[PDB]
Every structure is written in C-alpha cells, then in structure tokens.
C-alpha cells in the first residue's frame, strides 16, 4: 500500500510471530559481546550465525573488502568501543572467498569512489606481489589474496594505539586472521592470532604457509 | 587444542552439517542486492534475517550509531559502491533502540576515542534540543533520539554526492529512516523515504511526527 | 631546461641568496611553536607573516575552508600532535574574508568531491540560518557566515577528546575564534578564546555579537 | 589588555603598515593558483615564499609528514578542489628534512593519537627496508627517508580517482616528488614528476636514485 517497503514490513511481522519461544527478552537481556568481528559489506552470510552463536553476541563492523586503515575513525571508533569499554577478548578480520572488492581490485576495475578505498587492497597485491606471482592462475591468486588480506589488515588492528594501549596495560586481547568460505560455509584457520606484540614471528610463520 | 577459537570452529562444523538442503550453492549464486543496510555495530540482530530475506540479499555497512559523516569515506565507499555499482534499489538508515553509542552519547559519558565519532549524535541531540525537550523523561528522549538520529543520518545520504548524482542521472533510488526495537523484534517506519531531492518537505513531515 | 619547474627552482636560489644575513641556521635551530594554526587552503596569506612571527614559530594545518571535523583523524592528529607534544599555548581556527570554500559552498555551487567536505560548511548554514536571514543581502551573509564557521569550528576543536584531556590534566591552553581580511590584511578578533570548558558562555556572547 | 594575543594584533597592524606599497588589493586579486603544494605541518618556511611567488599563488594543504591517504577526504577534496575547479598545472608533495613527524616514526616513538597517522610514514619504513638498510647510518636513512616518503605520497596523488580521471579526461597535470633542507633552504628535485599514468617508470628511474 506505497508503503514502498511493505514487503519487508511483511516478512517482518512474519518473522517476529515464528519466533513464539519468547526470548526477544533473551537477546535484549544479552550482555557485553566478546568478540569484534570486521568483515565485508558483502554480507554474504552474517558472523553470529557462520560461527553458531546468538546474534549481538558478535560486535560488527562492515566496509568494503574489511580494510582497516590506520588512520579510519569510523573502524577504530568501533575498535576502541569495543576493546576498550566492552572488553571483548578477541577481534578477527574475516575474509570472505569470492569478495567483490578484493575483486575489482586484483583486475584493476573502475568502479568510481570506492576506487580509492580498494586501493588498500591494491597495496596488499604490491605488498606480496612476488609472492602472488607464483600462482600464475585466476582463483589461486584471489583466493590467495583474500587471504593475505585479511593478514594485513590485523597487522593495521595490532598495530593500533588502542591496541597497543591495551597490552600494555595487561588487558587480554588476542587478534585473528581469518576467511570464510560462502561456497561452502566453511571457516579456514590462517594461523595468525596475535596476542602481544609478538607479531613480527606470528605472521612471518602464517605469511610463509603460502610460498607456492 | 590450544585452538584459541576451537569452540568457533566447533559451532562452525556444527552450522555447517545443520544446512543439509544443499544450497551454500543457492547463496554462492546469490545475484545482486537490492539494498543498503546501514546500521549500528550493536549487531543485535541481523538484517536480512529481522527483515526475512537470504543473507547477502542485503548488502551492509555497520559503524557505532549508524553515523553517517559527509567526509567518512568508508561509508561513502559502501554506498557509491551499493548504488553505482549494485544498482541498489534503496539506502536505509536503520537505528536500534537501546544501543549502547547512542546512549554513551545523550548521557555525556566519556568512552574515550569514540567519543569523538559520538559527537555527530550528539550534534542531532543539540539540532534537536527543544524538541528533545518537552519530552522531559529519559526513555522517552533516547526513544526520540536513536529516531532523529536515523533521520539525519539519511538527510546525510541523500546530500552525498553520490545519490544526487544517481538522481540526477535518472537511476531510481530511495533512501529511508527507519528504526527496529530489540525488545519486540518490531520495526518501525518513521515515514522517512526519500527518491528525489524533495528531502525538505518529506523530513519536515517527518521530523513533525514527534512534537511533544 | 625541461627542468618543468626550472622556473622554481631558479626563483628559489634567487631567495636563498636574498637571505644573507645568515640565519637559516636561526631557522633550524628555531625550537616548538607555541601555536596551532588550522586555517583554508586559500593560502591568501601565511600565518607567521600575517601574524608577524619568525616561519616554523606557527604551526599549520590547511583544509578547504578550515573545518574541523570530528571524526577527522587527518586534523585530529595535527592536533594531537601540536597539544600533547608540542605544548602549543594557543590554537585557533582562523577564517579568512571571500574564502573560495565559503562561497561554493553558500550558493549550492556543485564542484565534485569537494562539495561533501563544504557540507560541514552549508551546515554551519543551516545551524544559524535565522540569524543569516536578518543580514538579507549577500557580502554580509558571507562575511557574517566566514565568522560563524571560524566560531563553530572552535567549538569541534573544543570538544575534542584531545583538548578536554589537556584541560582535564591541568595543561594551560586557549582556543581562538579568528578572521582575517585578504582586502585589508586586517586581523578581527570575535571574541571567541575558551581556555576551560565554558564554551557555552564564551560562544553566546560570541555569537551574540551578530544580532541583526 | 587581557588581550590573551594582543601580541598578535600588534605584530599585525606592525605588518599590516609595513606594505605601504597599497596592494592589499593586488593580493585580493590574485587570479588562480596554478599549483597545488602539499606539505608537512612542520611549516618550517611558507610555500610561495621558499618558492619565490606571491602568496595565495600557491594553493596549500598542510598535514603532520604531508601523508596523502588514499581515504583521506580532508586531502582528496583539498586536490579535487585544486585540480578539477582550480585547474592547477602541478600538484607537487614536498617533504622537508629534520622533520618532526618522519622522526617521531622512524624511531618508534610513542606520541599518542598521530601514532596511528605516523604508521602510513612508518609503511614507507617498511616499503624500503632493505634500501634503507644499506644507510646504517642516522641521518642518511631519516634524509632518504623523508625523500622517499615524499615519493610513494606522490604515488598516492597519482593513484587518486581525482588526478587519474583528469588525465583521462585530457586534462594537463604534473605531479612532483619534492624536498627542501630547513638548514640550507635550497629546495632538491628528486626526478619524481608523473604527467600521464607513466607513474611505474618514473618512480622506478626516482627511487634508483638512492641505492646505496
Ligand atoms: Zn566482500
Ligand atoms: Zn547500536
Ligand atoms: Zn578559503
Ligand atoms: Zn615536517
């Protein structure tokens, strides 16, 4: 009824009744996440679910192809808020197989503004570019790349003063490199969980587990 | 097994095995969204799933208070994105009741780094003092505030470069305020849905629809 | 000699001559500035000269139309940086008369890119819309709008985390409100320096002192 | 008089007296400016003059090690607003030797907030580490370090949406890598100046130019 978005206000009612276990009291009753999941806007399937957990148990954040630039208010605000006030235990920057902008990226594609942001990306793909080489292939090098993506990007999260701060003032805090596949929903390990500045070793060793 | 995230990993085995009706396919093949969700990090519930749709269906972006800064490129990254090249076929700025960034703001309370990205809800809080006002309870004005605050943030979008051009280039698109409630799951519509630079007359509209 | 800039470099070694009195060493050993200066990228004139002062005795950042946002990190470090280690006594945000960025930004003129940064600056516009109204011509606008950007600016400076820490920690520290006349290389004081926060007296009197 | 910067406004109508030669107005007057100088807020000495032009003849953006971000919007408008509506001949980044930001890095030094804006310099220490080392001096790294550093920020300009459309688009633009000593105020050419996407021969020929 030009509601525009009826539809969705539809699927919504119907949503809230199928959920007769009454609980919404359950999640509003939730508690402090203890976790920071930065993924991608390609939301292809949402954290909590991906790792089995009630939703809000997860803190969120989403930017295109999950870059954290050292020096974006928008990711540290929510890093900060969530090391420093909710106390999580554990960030991980998640990767997903298939992403569009670690795509456009890799094949130098125009897209317009966004051009700029995916030029982090781009600087992952010089980074490790040697590396990358030797998969002289298609799929290798983005699955590779997404990979190494998601590496670097935690090494911009370790390297924050929030961070940093944090460690050196003893809170526990570990910081995960991690992907996902949307193929088949599948979560892969990369070995790189950093939990005091002892990163310099910790991803030498996770970088390594490429050389093709 | 020293595993760190080994319980995740778990849940994960656990989620995976629980999809029998295969069809990682179904989503791996998902098509283009045809929405934007900006949201609050307080990821209390996921958008796809409160508004009843596949995952990645919808496409999303999430920062603390759903803020959208003129100059944040990281959003305005996702959403030249969303709407240039994903032809998305509407922009909704969805606010949360009882989020924990909207409220550290109304209540002055220092969180540090965050407090600076909290200032921008803060702004709405004073642009809207008088009326915030002659609602002299608390969850009343925080009610009132996570609204207004969804509201200029799409004042915001829609005054991005972005979307005027999309407009002026003819390419359908609307932008809508929109908030949901985590205690009943519910979501309301603030009439807040803009499709051409006829902002000012349909946020007055809007934005009367508080007036204590 | 396809030198491209030869023409610089030449009117470079004539002003490294012109300086006999040999003191580029006074320069270099010139010890901390005592002030931030942010002002436009209009570099009508430079600060230390306007201000009469040895270069390198003022400290600078330079945006189109000196604005601070909150969330800027590009200014915010300046900032950071000039307060906590520089130990500037005085920072001040000064506007300057027929500024290119004030002007676009006024007329609704579309530029590109840059007119989501002069959004900051049409806010300014909105916020104190009213009182632009009773000055219903042009030159005054402009001129009284050139000031309350400079003043509300302050307030951004004011009210970040950076400054209210070095209050809060005793540190000495003023933030000035200030215009200048690239017609008339005159310097007008609005009567707009906090020092603690009592900006919400400090302002009003400020701003008080339009009144059409 | 309470003045809290009378010393200001005196050292003003000091200077503002001292230009007899009525040409207030010939500033005022002063036509486009043609160049684009991006510089340090250490501003050791101003553009113009260093460069031998009137002021307001050169364009200015000023951030601490004159770090040009790829998501930067307080730079990228500050360049869009040059090049597109200024049309500009040159954008030029220029380092500056003994500068405080390019220090601070290099000798991971703990400043606060600009920690995390120094990493982008402290990228470029990465970038270049084995040429760096081959310097197993002090003085010699920090001087090719801040040349360097001025280099890869070109390769940012360069890399820009901005700069890269008005190349297609016929628009004449050079882009030069540039550094001048604070002690000996001559000013280096560091062979670092792209005209046309050209930029991975040029730079490459540039940063020859160091091998020790
Ligand atoms: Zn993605
Ligand atoms: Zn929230
Ligand atoms: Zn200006
Ligand atoms: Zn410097």
């Given at each position: 009824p030009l509601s525009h978005l009826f539809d969705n206000?539809?699927?919504?009612?119907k949503r809230?009744?199928?959920?007769d276990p009454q609980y919404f009291s359950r999640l509003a009753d939730q508690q402090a996440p203890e976790y920071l999941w930065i993924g991608c806007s390609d939301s292809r399937v949402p954290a909590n679910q991906i790792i089995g957990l009630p939703p809000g148990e997860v803190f969120v954040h989403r930017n295109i192809a999950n870059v954290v630039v050292h020096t974006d208010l928008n990711?540290?605000?929510?890093?900060?808020?969530?090391?420093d006030l909710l106390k999580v235990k554990h960030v991980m920057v998640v990767g997903?197989?298939?992403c569009s902008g670690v795509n456009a990226a890799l094949?130098?594609?125009?897209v317009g503004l966004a051009d700029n942001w995916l030029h982090h990306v781009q600087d992952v793909r010089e980074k490790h570019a040697a590396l990358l080489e030797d998969?002289?292939?298609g799929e290798a090098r983005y699955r590779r790349l997404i990979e190494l993506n998601a590496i670097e990007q935690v090494v911009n999260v370790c390297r924050t003063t929030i961070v940093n701060d944090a460690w050196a003032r003893g809170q526990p805090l570990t910081v995960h490199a991690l992907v996902y596949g949307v193929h088949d929903g599948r979560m892969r390990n990369l070995?790189?969980?950093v939990s005091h500045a002892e990163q310099l070793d910790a991803?030498?060793?996770?970088?390594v587990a490429a050389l093709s």
């Open positions: 206000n539809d699927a919504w009612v809230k009744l199928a959920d990711c540290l605000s929510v890093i900060q808020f969530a090391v997903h197989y298939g094949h130098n594609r125009r998969w002289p292939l070995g790189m969980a991803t030498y060793r996770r970088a």
